[PDB]
Amino acid sequence: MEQKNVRNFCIIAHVDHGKSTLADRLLEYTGAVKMQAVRMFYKAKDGNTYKLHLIDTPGHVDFSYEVSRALAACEGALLLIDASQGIEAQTVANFWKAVEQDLVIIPVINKIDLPSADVDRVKKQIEEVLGLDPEEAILASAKEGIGIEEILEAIVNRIPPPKGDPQKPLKALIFDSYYDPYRGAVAFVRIFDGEVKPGDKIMLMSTGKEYEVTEVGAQTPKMTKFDKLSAGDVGYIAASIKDVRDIRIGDTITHAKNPTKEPVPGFQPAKPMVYAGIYPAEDTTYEELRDALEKYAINDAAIVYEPESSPALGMGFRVGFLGLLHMEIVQERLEREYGVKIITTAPNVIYRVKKKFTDEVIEVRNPMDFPDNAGLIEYVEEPFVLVTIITPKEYVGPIIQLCQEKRGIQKNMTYLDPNTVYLEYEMPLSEIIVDFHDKIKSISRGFASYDYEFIGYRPSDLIKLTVLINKKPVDALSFIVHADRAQKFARRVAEKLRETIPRQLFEVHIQVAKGGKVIASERIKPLR
Ligand SMILES: Nc1nc2c(ncn2[C@@H]2O[C@H](COP(=O)(O)OP(=O)(O)O)[C@@H](O)[C@H]2O)c(=O)[nH]1
Numbered sequence: 001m002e003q004k005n006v007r008n009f010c011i012i013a014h015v016d017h018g019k020s021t022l023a024d025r026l027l028e029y030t031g032a033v034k035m036q037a038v039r040m041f042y043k044a045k046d047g048n049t050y051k052l053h054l055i056d057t058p059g060h061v062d063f064s065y066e067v068s069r070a071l072a073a074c075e076g077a078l079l080l081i082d083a084s085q086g087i088e089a090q091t092v093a094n095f096w097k098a099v100e101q102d103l104v105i106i107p108v109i110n111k112i113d114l115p116s117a118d119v120d121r122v123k124k125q126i127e128e129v130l131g132l133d134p135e136e137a138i139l140a141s142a143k144e145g146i147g148i149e150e151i152l153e154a155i156v157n158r159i160p161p162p163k164g165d166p167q168k169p170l171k172a173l174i175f176d177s178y179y180d181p182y183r184g185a186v187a188f189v190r191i192f193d194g195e196v197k198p199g200d201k202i203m204l205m206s207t208g209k210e211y212e213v214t215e216v217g218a219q220t221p222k223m224t225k226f227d228k229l230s231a232g233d234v235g236y237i238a239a240s241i242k243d244v245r246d247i248r249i250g251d252t253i254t255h256a257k258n259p260t261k262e263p264v265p266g267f268q269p270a271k272p273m274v275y276a277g278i279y280p281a282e283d284t285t286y287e288e289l290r291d292a293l294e295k296y297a298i299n300d301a302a303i304v305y306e307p308e309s310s311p312a313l314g315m316g317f318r319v320g321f322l323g324l325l326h327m328e329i330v331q332e333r334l335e336r337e338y339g340v341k342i343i344t345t346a347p348n349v350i351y352r353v354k355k356k357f358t359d360e361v362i363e364v365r366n367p368m369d370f371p372d373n374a375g376l377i378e379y380v381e382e383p384f385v386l387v388t389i390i391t392p393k394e395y396v397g398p399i400i401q402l403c404q405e406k407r408g409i410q411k412n413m414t415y416l417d418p419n420t421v422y423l424e425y426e427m428p429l430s431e432i433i434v435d436f437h438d439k440i441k442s443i444s445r446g447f448a449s450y451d452y453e454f455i456g457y458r459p460s461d462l463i464k465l466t467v468l469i470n471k472k473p474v475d476a477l478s479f480i481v482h483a484d485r486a487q488k489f490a491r492r493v494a495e496k497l498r499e500t501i502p503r504q505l506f507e508v509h510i511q512v513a514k515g516g517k518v519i520a521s522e523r524i525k526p527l528r
Protein backbone atom coordinates (compact mmCIF):
# COMPACT_ATOMS: atom_id res chain seq x y z
CA MET A 1 0.00 0.00 0.00
CA GLU A 2 0.94 3.65 0.42
CA GLN A 3 3.15 5.12 3.15
CA LYS A 4 0.38 7.59 3.95
CA ASN A 5 -1.43 4.55 5.34
CA VAL A 6 1.51 3.34 7.41
CA ARG A 7 2.01 3.90 11.13
CA ASN A 8 5.34 3.25 12.89
CA PHE A 9 5.09 3.29 16.68
CA CYS A 10 6.54 1.87 19.89
CA ILE A 11 5.50 1.55 23.51
CA ILE A 12 7.50 3.20 26.24
CA ALA A 13 6.73 2.64 29.90
CA HIS A 14 8.36 2.36 33.29
CA VAL A 15 8.76 -1.37 34.01
CA ASP A 16 5.58 -3.07 35.36
CA HIS A 17 3.15 -0.50 33.94
CA GLY A 18 1.80 -2.86 31.28
CA LYS A 19 3.87 -2.58 28.10
CA SER A 20 3.88 -6.31 27.31
CA THR A 21 0.25 -6.79 28.32
CA LEU A 22 -0.75 -4.00 25.93
CA ALA A 23 1.23 -5.29 22.96
CA ASP A 24 -0.82 -8.47 23.21
CA ARG A 25 -4.21 -6.77 23.22
CA LEU A 26 -3.05 -4.72 20.22
CA LEU A 27 -1.87 -7.78 18.29
CA GLU A 28 -4.86 -9.81 19.47
CA TYR A 29 -7.28 -7.03 18.54
CA THR A 30 -5.77 -6.53 15.08
CA GLY A 31 -4.91 -10.17 14.42
CA ALA A 32 -8.50 -11.41 14.72
CA VAL A 33 12.51 -15.32 18.06
CA LYS A 34 11.84 -12.32 20.33
CA MET A 35 8.89 -10.07 19.50
CA GLN A 36 10.04 -7.25 17.22
CA ALA A 37 9.22 -5.43 13.98
CA VAL A 38 5.65 -6.65 14.32
CA ARG A 39 3.43 -5.79 11.34
CA MET A 40 -0.30 -5.36 11.88
CA PHE A 41 -3.25 -4.39 9.72
CA TYR A 42 -6.04 -2.23 11.12
CA LYS A 43 -9.27 -1.17 9.46
CA ALA A 44 -9.97 2.18 11.09
CA LYS A 45 -13.33 3.83 11.55
CA ASP A 46 -12.60 6.12 8.60
CA GLY A 47 -12.92 2.99 6.50
CA ASN A 48 -9.28 2.66 5.50
CA THR A 49 -7.00 -0.19 6.52
CA TYR A 50 -3.61 0.76 7.89
CA LYS A 51 -0.29 -1.08 8.11
CA LEU A 52 0.99 -0.64 11.67
CA HIS A 53 4.48 -1.51 12.88
CA LEU A 54 5.08 -2.16 16.55
CA ILE A 55 8.71 -1.67 17.45
CA ASP A 56 9.61 -3.24 20.76
CA THR A 57 11.91 -1.15 22.96
CA PRO A 58 14.20 -2.05 25.91
CA GLY A 59 13.07 -0.89 29.34
CA HIS A 60 16.31 -0.57 31.33
CA VAL A 61 18.79 2.32 31.49
CA ASP A 62 21.51 -0.18 30.55
CA PHE A 63 20.05 -0.29 27.04
CA SER A 64 19.59 3.47 26.69
CA TYR A 65 21.45 3.73 23.38
CA GLU A 66 19.36 0.92 21.92
CA VAL A 67 16.21 2.59 23.18
CA SER A 68 17.15 5.80 21.36
CA ARG A 69 17.78 3.86 18.15
CA ALA A 70 14.33 2.22 18.38
CA LEU A 71 12.65 5.58 18.93
CA ALA A 72 14.51 6.93 15.87
CA ALA A 73 12.75 4.21 13.84
CA CYS A 74 9.21 5.34 14.79
CA GLU A 75 6.98 8.38 14.11
CA GLY A 76 5.24 8.12 17.44
CA ALA A 77 5.12 6.39 20.78
CA LEU A 78 2.52 5.22 23.28
CA LEU A 79 3.55 6.58 26.68
CA LEU A 80 2.08 3.98 29.02
CA ILE A 81 1.56 5.14 32.63
CA ASP A 82 0.24 3.05 35.55
CA ALA A 83 -2.80 4.80 37.07
CA SER A 84 -1.94 3.33 40.47
CA GLN A 85 1.67 4.48 40.23
CA GLY A 86 1.74 7.68 38.21
CA ILE A 87 4.91 8.94 36.55
CA GLU A 88 8.12 7.18 37.52
CA ALA A 89 11.85 7.57 36.73
CA GLN A 90 11.89 5.66 33.44
CA THR A 91 8.61 7.35 32.41
CA VAL A 92 10.23 10.79 32.43
CA ALA A 93 13.54 9.67 30.94
CA ASN A 94 11.84 7.84 28.09
CA PHE A 95 9.47 10.72 27.47
CA TRP A 96 12.39 13.09 26.85
CA LYS A 97 14.18 10.61 24.66
CA ALA A 98 11.01 10.39 22.57
CA VAL A 99 10.72 14.20 22.61
CA GLU A 100 14.32 14.42 21.37
CA GLN A 101 13.49 12.16 18.42
CA ASP A 102 10.51 14.37 17.55
CA LEU A 103 7.95 11.60 18.11
CA VAL A 104 4.23 12.17 18.49
CA ILE A 105 3.59 10.97 22.03
CA ILE A 106 0.30 9.34 22.95
CA PRO A 107 -0.16 9.03 26.72
CA VAL A 108 -2.22 6.08 27.86
CA ILE A 109 -3.13 5.61 31.51
CA ASN A 110 -3.20 1.89 32.19
CA LYS A 111 -4.65 -0.25 35.01
CA ILE A 112 -7.66 2.04 35.51
CA ASP A 113 -9.46 -1.09 36.70
CA LEU A 114 -7.35 -1.19 39.87
CA PRO A 115 -8.86 0.09 43.17
CA SER A 116 -5.73 2.18 43.66
CA ALA A 117 -5.99 3.80 40.22
CA ASP A 118 -6.11 7.60 40.25
CA VAL A 119 -6.49 8.92 36.70
CA ASP A 120 -7.11 12.49 37.81
CA ARG A 121 -3.76 12.51 39.56
CA VAL A 122 -1.86 11.04 36.63
CA LYS A 123 -3.61 13.51 34.29
CA LYS A 124 -2.41 16.30 36.54
CA GLN A 125 1.14 14.90 36.39
CA ILE A 126 1.02 14.58 32.60
CA GLU A 127 0.04 18.22 32.17
CA GLU A 128 2.29 19.65 34.86
CA VAL A 129 5.38 17.48 34.50
CA LEU A 130 5.23 16.41 30.86
CA GLY A 131 3.42 19.48 29.55
CA LEU A 132 0.91 17.36 27.63
CA ASP A 133 -2.83 17.90 27.16
CA PRO A 134 -4.45 15.61 29.76
CA GLU A 135 -7.23 15.43 27.20
CA GLU A 136 -5.00 13.53 24.79
CA ALA A 137 -4.63 10.83 27.45
CA ILE A 138 -6.30 7.52 26.61
CA LEU A 139 -7.71 5.73 29.66
CA ALA A 140 -7.33 1.98 29.40
CA SER A 141 -6.97 -1.47 30.87
CA ALA A 142 -4.76 -3.86 28.92
CA LYS A 143 -5.83 -6.52 31.42
CA GLU A 144 -9.41 -6.14 30.20
CA GLY A 145 -9.08 -5.01 26.58
CA ILE A 146 -10.61 -1.69 27.61
CA GLY A 147 -9.47 1.12 25.34
CA ILE A 148 -7.60 -0.97 22.77
CA GLU A 149 -9.51 0.27 19.72
CA GLU A 150 -9.24 3.77 21.15
CA ILE A 151 -5.46 3.30 21.07
CA LEU A 152 -5.40 2.07 17.49
CA GLU A 153 -7.46 5.10 16.46
CA ALA A 154 -5.16 7.53 18.26
CA ILE A 155 -2.26 5.90 16.40
CA VAL A 156 -3.89 6.22 12.99
CA ASN A 157 -5.21 9.72 13.68
CA ARG A 158 -2.36 11.19 15.75
CA ILE A 159 0.88 9.61 14.51
CA PRO A 160 2.05 10.93 11.12
CA PRO A 161 2.82 8.48 8.28
CA PRO A 162 6.43 7.73 7.37
CA LYS A 163 8.06 10.21 5.01
CA GLY A 164 10.57 8.74 2.60
CA ASP A 165 11.13 8.09 -1.10
CA PRO A 166 11.28 4.45 -2.28
CA GLN A 167 12.98 5.61 -5.49
CA LYS A 168 15.85 7.22 -3.62
CA PRO A 169 19.00 5.30 -2.57
CA LEU A 170 18.30 2.74 0.15
CA LYS A 171 18.65 4.06 3.69
CA ALA A 172 17.58 1.64 6.43
CA LEU A 173 18.26 2.11 10.14
CA ILE A 174 19.29 -0.90 12.18
CA PHE A 175 17.48 -0.69 15.54
CA ASP A 176 17.72 -4.30 16.72
CA SER A 177 19.10 -7.73 15.78
CA TYR A 178 19.60 -11.33 16.86
CA TYR A 179 21.40 -14.42 15.65
CA ASP A 180 19.40 -16.90 13.61
CA PRO A 181 21.19 -20.28 13.48
CA TYR A 182 19.69 -20.72 10.02
CA ARG A 183 19.39 -17.18 8.68
CA GLY A 184 22.59 -15.90 10.32
CA ALA A 185 22.90 -12.48 11.97
CA VAL A 186 19.55 -10.80 11.43
CA ALA A 187 18.93 -7.05 11.38
CA PHE A 188 15.62 -5.50 12.38
CA VAL A 189 15.36 -2.34 10.32
CA ARG A 190 13.36 0.75 9.52
CA ILE A 191 13.41 1.68 5.83
CA PHE A 192 13.61 5.48 5.38
CA ASP A 193 14.51 5.65 1.65
CA GLY A 194 14.45 3.13 -1.19
CA GLU A 195 13.62 -0.56 -1.22
CA VAL A 196 15.47 -3.76 -0.52
CA LYS A 197 14.86 -7.29 -1.71
CA PRO A 198 16.59 -10.70 -1.77
CA GLY A 199 19.52 -10.70 -4.16
CA ASP A 200 20.39 -7.06 -3.56
CA LYS A 201 23.93 -6.30 -2.49
CA ILE A 202 23.82 -4.09 0.62
CA MET A 203 26.53 -2.21 2.49
CA LEU A 204 26.97 -1.27 6.15
CA MET A 205 27.95 2.40 6.25
CA SER A 206 29.97 2.32 9.49
CA THR A 207 32.17 -0.47 8.10
CA GLY A 208 31.81 -0.40 4.34
CA LYS A 209 31.33 -4.18 4.49
CA GLU A 210 29.08 -5.64 1.78
CA TYR A 211 26.63 -8.53 1.68
CA GLU A 212 23.97 -10.05 -0.55
CA VAL A 213 20.45 -10.07 0.87
CA THR A 214 19.05 -13.56 1.26
CA GLU A 215 15.70 -12.71 2.79
CA VAL A 216 13.49 -9.79 3.91
CA GLY A 217 10.17 -9.62 5.77
CA ALA A 218 8.61 -9.10 9.18
CA GLN A 219 7.03 -10.74 12.23
CA THR A 220 3.30 -11.27 11.71
CA PRO A 221 3.93 -12.23 14.56
CA LYS A 222 5.73 -15.23 13.07
CA MET A 223 8.86 -14.50 11.04
CA THR A 224 7.28 -13.99 7.63
CA LYS A 225 9.39 -13.34 4.56
CA PHE A 226 8.06 -10.84 2.01
CA ASP A 227 9.52 -10.22 -1.43
CA LYS A 228 10.62 -6.74 -0.38
CA LEU A 229 10.61 -3.88 2.14
CA SER A 230 9.98 -0.32 0.92
CA ALA A 231 10.42 3.17 2.34
CA GLY A 232 8.37 3.52 5.50
CA ASP A 233 8.31 -0.22 6.24
CA VAL A 234 9.68 -2.02 9.28
CA GLY A 235 10.99 -5.57 9.13
CA TYR A 236 14.14 -7.66 9.01
CA ILE A 237 16.95 -8.45 6.60
CA ALA A 238 19.16 -11.54 6.29
CA ALA A 239 22.26 -11.62 4.10
CA SER A 240 24.56 -14.42 5.25
CA ILE A 241 26.05 -12.17 7.93
CA LYS A 242 28.54 -13.86 10.27
CA ASP A 243 27.51 -12.22 13.54
CA VAL A 244 25.57 -9.47 15.26
CA ARG A 245 28.69 -7.29 15.61
CA ASP A 246 28.60 -6.88 11.82
CA ILE A 247 25.14 -5.28 12.00
CA ARG A 248 25.57 -2.99 14.98
CA ILE A 249 22.54 -1.11 16.23
CA GLY A 250 22.27 2.47 15.06
CA ASP A 251 24.15 1.61 11.85
CA THR A 252 22.78 2.25 8.36
CA ILE A 253 22.15 -0.22 5.56
CA THR A 254 22.28 1.13 2.01
CA HIS A 255 23.03 -0.25 -1.46
CA ALA A 256 26.61 -1.14 -2.37
CA LYS A 257 26.19 0.09 -5.98
CA ASN A 258 24.07 3.21 -5.41
CA PRO A 259 24.66 4.23 -1.76
CA THR A 260 22.58 6.87 0.02
CA LYS A 261 24.34 10.22 0.61
CA GLU A 262 24.61 10.05 4.39
CA PRO A 263 23.90 7.46 7.06
CA VAL A 264 21.18 7.88 9.66
CA PRO A 265 22.73 10.05 12.43
CA GLY A 266 23.50 8.87 15.95
CA PHE A 267 25.60 5.75 15.40
CA GLN A 268 27.65 4.63 18.40
CA PRO A 269 29.47 1.34 18.97
CA ALA A 270 28.50 -0.61 22.12
CA LYS A 271 30.17 0.81 25.23
CA PRO A 272 30.66 -1.49 28.26
CA MET A 273 30.50 0.51 31.52
CA VAL A 274 30.70 -2.11 34.27
CA TYR A 275 33.15 -5.00 34.49
CA ALA A 276 33.51 -8.05 36.73
CA GLY A 277 35.47 -11.25 36.95
CA ILE A 278 33.42 -14.38 36.24
CA TYR A 279 34.98 -17.61 37.53
CA PRO A 280 33.86 -21.25 37.31
CA ALA A 281 32.19 -22.50 40.50
CA GLU A 282 31.19 -25.85 42.07
CA ASP A 283 32.08 -28.55 39.54
CA THR A 284 31.91 -26.31 36.45
CA THR A 285 35.31 -25.96 34.77
CA TYR A 286 37.11 -23.20 32.89
CA GLU A 287 36.43 -24.76 29.49
CA GLU A 288 32.72 -25.15 30.24
CA LEU A 289 32.66 -21.49 31.29
CA ARG A 290 34.63 -20.36 28.27
CA ASP A 291 32.53 -22.49 25.90
CA ALA A 292 29.32 -21.16 27.45
CA LEU A 293 30.48 -17.54 27.02
CA GLU A 294 31.34 -18.06 23.36
CA LYS A 295 27.84 -19.39 22.75
CA TYR A 296 26.08 -16.63 24.68
CA ALA A 297 28.20 -13.95 22.95
CA ILE A 298 26.74 -14.96 19.59
CA ASN A 299 23.42 -13.40 20.63
CA ASP A 300 24.92 -10.40 22.46
CA ALA A 301 26.77 -7.72 20.48
CA ALA A 302 27.68 -5.62 23.56
CA ILE A 303 29.43 -8.08 25.89
CA VAL A 304 33.25 -8.30 25.93
CA TYR A 305 35.51 -10.64 27.88
CA GLU A 306 39.08 -11.83 28.22
CA PRO A 307 40.91 -14.60 30.15
CA GLU A 308 41.81 -13.66 33.70
CA SER A 309 43.48 -15.53 36.57
CA SER A 310 43.71 -14.91 40.31
CA PRO A 311 45.76 -16.81 42.92
CA ALA A 312 42.85 -18.25 44.89
CA LEU A 313 40.16 -18.35 42.19
CA GLY A 314 42.34 -19.72 39.42
CA MET A 315 41.26 -18.95 35.85
CA GLY A 316 38.15 -17.05 34.90
CA PHE A 317 37.13 -14.12 32.72
CA ARG A 318 37.06 -10.33 33.04
CA VAL A 319 33.70 -9.48 31.47
CA GLY A 320 32.35 -6.06 30.55
CA PHE A 321 28.64 -5.25 30.62
CA LEU A 322 26.44 -2.31 29.63
CA GLY A 323 25.37 -2.12 33.27
CA LEU A 324 24.11 -4.09 36.29
CA LEU A 325 20.99 -5.49 34.65
CA HIS A 326 22.99 -6.53 31.62
CA MET A 327 25.34 -8.36 33.99
CA GLU A 328 22.41 -10.06 35.75
CA ILE A 329 20.88 -11.13 32.43
CA VAL A 330 24.19 -12.63 31.36
CA GLN A 331 24.62 -14.40 34.72
CA GLU A 332 21.17 -15.97 34.82
CA ARG A 333 21.37 -17.04 31.17
CA LEU A 334 24.84 -18.51 31.57
CA GLU A 335 23.72 -20.81 34.39
CA ARG A 336 20.26 -21.40 32.92
CA GLU A 337 21.01 -21.76 29.21
CA TYR A 338 24.27 -23.66 29.57
CA GLY A 339 23.90 -24.58 33.22
CA VAL A 340 27.35 -23.49 34.36
CA LYS A 341 28.24 -22.65 37.94
CA ILE A 342 29.96 -19.29 38.36
CA ILE A 343 31.12 -16.97 41.08
CA THR A 344 31.18 -13.29 40.15
CA THR A 345 33.36 -10.64 41.75
CA ALA A 346 32.09 -7.29 42.92
CA PRO A 347 31.58 -5.18 39.75
CA ASN A 348 33.75 -2.17 38.88
CA VAL A 349 33.70 0.85 36.54
CA ILE A 350 36.47 1.74 34.08
CA TYR A 351 38.97 4.14 35.66
CA ARG A 352 41.28 6.49 33.79
CA VAL A 353 44.71 6.45 35.42
CA LYS A 354 47.60 8.79 34.74
CA LYS A 355 50.92 7.46 36.03
CA LYS A 356 54.15 9.42 36.30
CA PHE A 357 56.19 7.83 33.54
CA THR A 358 53.51 6.87 31.03
CA ASP A 359 52.39 9.58 28.60
CA GLU A 360 49.01 8.11 27.78
CA VAL A 361 46.30 7.69 30.38
CA ILE A 362 45.58 4.01 31.06
CA GLU A 363 42.04 2.62 31.16
CA VAL A 364 41.63 0.24 34.08
CA ARG A 365 38.85 -2.30 33.66
CA ASN A 366 40.24 -4.71 36.26
CA PRO A 367 41.23 -3.48 39.76
CA MET A 368 44.14 -5.93 39.69
CA ASP A 369 45.69 -3.76 36.98
CA PHE A 370 45.36 -0.58 39.04
CA PRO A 371 48.97 0.39 40.02
CA ASP A 372 50.00 -1.01 43.42
CA ASN A 373 52.49 1.83 43.81
CA ALA A 374 50.30 4.79 44.77
CA GLY A 375 53.32 7.06 44.52
CA LEU A 376 53.49 6.54 40.77
CA ILE A 377 49.94 7.82 40.23
CA GLU A 378 49.54 11.38 38.96
CA TYR A 379 45.76 11.17 39.08
CA VAL A 380 42.75 9.02 38.40
CA GLU A 381 39.32 9.91 37.08
CA GLU A 382 36.09 7.94 37.28
CA PRO A 383 32.77 8.09 35.40
CA PHE A 384 29.97 10.22 36.83
CA VAL A 385 26.27 10.02 36.05
CA LEU A 386 23.27 12.28 36.46
CA VAL A 387 20.71 10.40 38.58
CA THR A 388 17.02 11.30 38.47
CA ILE A 389 14.86 10.05 41.31
CA ILE A 390 11.10 10.12 41.83
CA THR A 391 9.76 9.45 45.33
CA PRO A 392 6.79 10.10 47.66
CA LYS A 393 7.72 13.12 49.83
CA GLU A 394 7.82 11.00 52.99
CA TYR A 395 11.08 9.36 51.90
CA VAL A 396 12.89 12.35 50.41
CA GLY A 397 14.98 12.81 53.56
CA PRO A 398 16.31 9.22 53.78
CA ILE A 399 17.01 9.22 50.05
CA ILE A 400 18.88 12.53 50.21
CA GLN A 401 20.98 11.14 53.02
CA LEU A 402 21.67 7.96 51.03
CA CYS A 403 22.73 9.98 48.01
CA GLN A 404 25.21 12.13 49.89
CA GLU A 405 26.55 9.11 51.73
CA LYS A 406 27.41 7.94 48.25
CA ARG A 407 29.20 11.15 47.26
CA GLY A 408 26.22 12.64 45.45
CA ILE A 409 25.86 16.34 44.61
CA GLN A 410 22.23 17.48 44.53
CA LYS A 411 21.60 19.58 41.43
CA ASN A 412 17.85 20.01 41.55
CA MET A 413 14.71 19.24 43.50
CA THR A 414 11.04 19.65 42.51
CA TYR A 415 7.54 18.44 43.39
CA LEU A 416 5.67 16.44 40.71
CA ASP A 417 2.58 17.02 42.85
CA PRO A 418 1.95 17.82 46.54
CA ASN A 419 3.22 14.37 47.58
CA THR A 420 5.83 13.55 44.97
CA VAL A 421 9.39 14.77 44.81
CA TYR A 422 11.76 14.84 41.87
CA LEU A 423 15.50 14.85 42.49
CA GLU A 424 18.64 15.12 40.37
CA TYR A 425 22.07 14.13 41.69
CA GLU A 426 25.51 13.90 40.14
CA MET A 427 27.05 10.70 41.47
CA PRO A 428 30.07 8.52 40.77
CA LEU A 429 28.82 5.43 38.89
CA SER A 430 31.12 3.35 41.12
CA GLU A 431 28.89 4.30 44.08
CA ILE A 432 25.71 3.52 42.17
CA ILE A 433 26.67 -0.01 41.14
CA VAL A 434 27.17 -1.16 44.74
CA ASP A 435 24.10 -1.65 46.96
CA PHE A 436 22.40 1.60 45.83
CA HIS A 437 19.44 -0.05 44.13
CA ASP A 438 18.44 -2.14 47.16
CA LYS A 439 19.10 0.61 49.70
CA ILE A 440 16.91 3.02 47.73
CA LYS A 441 14.30 0.29 47.37
CA SER A 442 14.11 -0.77 51.00
CA ILE A 443 13.96 2.81 52.30
CA SER A 444 11.11 3.71 49.93
CA ARG A 445 9.07 0.54 50.40
CA GLY A 446 9.87 0.00 46.73
CA PHE A 447 7.99 3.19 45.86
CA ALA A 448 10.95 5.31 44.75
CA SER A 449 12.33 4.92 41.22
CA TYR A 450 15.48 6.25 39.61
CA ASP A 451 17.27 6.55 36.29
CA TYR A 452 20.66 7.97 35.29
CA GLU A 453 22.85 9.00 32.36
CA PHE A 454 26.61 9.16 31.91
CA ILE A 455 27.91 12.72 32.15
CA GLY A 456 31.63 12.05 31.87
CA TYR A 457 34.89 11.49 33.73
CA ARG A 458 36.04 13.57 36.67
CA PRO A 459 39.26 13.32 38.70
CA SER A 460 38.76 11.97 42.22
CA ASP A 461 40.79 10.85 45.21
CA LEU A 462 40.53 7.06 44.67
CA ILE A 463 42.78 4.31 46.00
CA LYS A 464 43.27 0.57 45.71
CA LEU A 465 42.47 -1.66 48.66
CA THR A 466 43.73 -5.22 48.73
CA VAL A 467 42.27 -8.19 50.57
CA LEU A 468 44.50 -10.63 52.45
CA ILE A 469 43.38 -14.10 53.53
CA ASN A 470 45.89 -15.45 56.02
CA LYS A 471 48.52 -12.91 54.98
CA LYS A 472 47.97 -13.94 51.35
CA PRO A 473 46.42 -11.33 48.99
CA VAL A 474 43.74 -12.38 46.52
CA ASP A 475 43.95 -9.90 43.64
CA ALA A 476 40.43 -10.77 42.53
CA LEU A 477 39.26 -9.07 45.72
CA SER A 478 41.25 -5.85 45.44
CA PHE A 479 39.02 -2.86 44.71
CA ILE A 480 39.11 0.89 44.08
CA VAL A 481 37.39 3.25 46.52
CA HIS A 482 37.33 6.93 47.39
CA ALA A 483 39.92 7.68 50.09
CA ASP A 484 37.17 9.02 52.36
CA ARG A 485 35.06 5.87 52.05
CA ALA A 486 37.93 3.39 52.35
CA GLN A 487 37.62 2.64 56.08
CA LYS A 488 33.91 1.86 55.77
CA PHE A 489 34.27 -0.24 52.64
CA ALA A 490 37.17 -2.05 54.28
CA ARG A 491 35.00 -2.93 57.28
CA ARG A 492 32.01 -3.92 55.15
CA VAL A 493 34.09 -6.18 52.88
CA ALA A 494 35.99 -7.77 55.78
CA GLU A 495 32.84 -8.52 57.78
CA LYS A 496 31.09 -9.67 54.62
CA LEU A 497 33.88 -12.01 53.57
CA ARG A 498 34.10 -13.77 56.94
CA GLU A 499 30.51 -14.93 56.49
CA THR A 500 31.25 -15.67 52.85
CA ILE A 501 33.91 -18.23 53.71
CA PRO A 502 33.08 -21.48 55.59
CA ARG A 503 35.13 -22.76 58.53
CA GLN A 504 38.14 -25.08 58.49
CA LEU A 505 40.70 -26.54 60.92
CA PHE A 506 42.74 -23.33 60.61
CA GLU A 507 41.71 -19.83 61.69
CA VAL A 508 40.97 -17.64 58.67
CA HIS A 509 42.31 -14.13 59.14
CA ILE A 510 40.89 -11.58 56.72
CA GLN A 511 42.66 -8.26 56.25
CA VAL A 512 41.84 -5.26 54.11
CA ALA A 513 44.99 -3.27 53.44
CA LYS A 514 45.77 0.17 52.07
CA GLY A 515 49.25 0.20 50.55
CA GLY A 516 50.74 -2.32 52.94
CA LYS A 517 48.69 -0.88 55.81
CA VAL A 518 45.94 -3.07 57.28
CA ILE A 519 42.86 -0.92 57.99
CA ALA A 520 40.36 -3.71 58.69
CA SER A 521 40.76 -7.17 60.19
CA GLU A 522 38.32 -10.03 60.67
CA ARG A 523 38.91 -13.60 61.79
CA ILE A 524 36.75 -16.71 61.74
CA LYS A 525 37.93 -19.23 64.33
CA PRO A 526 38.97 -22.80 63.32
CA LEU A 527 36.51 -25.53 62.35
CA ARG A 528 34.76 -25.93 65.72
N1 LIG B 1 -4.96 -4.86 36.91
C1 LIG B 1 -4.22 -4.60 35.83
N2 LIG B 1 -3.04 -5.22 35.68
C2 LIG B 1 -2.28 -5.00 34.59
C3 LIG B 1 -2.69 -4.13 33.59
N3 LIG B 1 -1.75 -4.12 32.66
C4 LIG B 1 -0.78 -4.95 33.04
N4 LIG B 1 -1.10 -5.48 34.22
C5 LIG B 1 -0.27 -6.44 34.99
O1 LIG B 1 0.93 -5.83 35.49
C6 LIG B 1 1.93 -6.87 35.56
C7 LIG B 1 3.05 -6.52 34.57
O2 LIG B 1 2.53 -6.26 33.27
P1 LIG B 1 3.53 -5.97 32.04
O3 LIG B 1 2.83 -5.81 30.75
O4 LIG B 1 4.59 -7.19 32.03
O5 LIG B 1 4.37 -4.66 32.45
P2 LIG B 1 5.78 -4.30 31.74
O6 LIG B 1 6.69 -4.56 32.88
O7 LIG B 1 5.31 -2.81 31.33
O8 LIG B 1 5.61 -5.35 30.54
C8 LIG B 1 1.24 -8.16 35.12
O9 LIG B 1 0.55 -8.74 36.23
C9 LIG B 1 0.23 -7.59 34.12
O10 LIG B 1 -0.82 -8.54 33.92
C10 LIG B 1 -3.91 -3.47 33.72
O11 LIG B 1 -4.30 -2.70 32.85
N5 LIG B 1 -4.69 -3.71 34.86
Ligand SMILES: [Mg+2]
Binds near residue numbers: 019020021
Ligand atom coordinates in the same frame (compact mmCIF):
# COMPACT_ATOMS: atom_id res chain seq x y z
MG1 LIG C 1 7.30 -6.25 29.65
